[PDB]
C-alpha cells in the first residue's frame, strides 16, 4: 500500500550591495 | 502495513548584508 | 510502495563589495 510522504536539506543567497559611500 | 516513507528537495538564502564602508 | 518525496529550509549571502571612496 501507499507510504507516507518523506523535509529536504537546507544554498546561499546572493551577495549584498556595495557598502556605504565614503 | 503502510508502505515505507518517501527527503524532499534541497531554496537559496536571503541577500547578504551591505559591504564595508567606503 | 514507498511514499512521495517530502523542500528544505532556505544561508544569507556574502557581504557586498566595499562602498565607493569619497
Residue numbers in the entry:
A (entry chain C), B (entry chain E), C (entry chain D): 1 to 6, 8 to 11, 13 to 24
Quoted from the paper:
Collagen is a critical structural protein in mammals. The principal characteristics of collagen are its triple helical structure and triplet repeat amino acid sequence (XaaYaaGly)n; the Xaa and Yaa positions are typically filled by proline (Pro, P) and the post-translationally modified amino acid hydroxyproline (Hyp, O), respectively. Our lab has investigated the structure and function of collagen by synthesizing an array of collagen model peptides with novel biophysical properties, most notably by integrating the non-natural amino acids aza-glycine (azGly, azG)4 and aza-proline (azPro, azP). These aza-peptides have the α-CH group from one or more amino acid residues in their peptide chain replaced with a N atom.
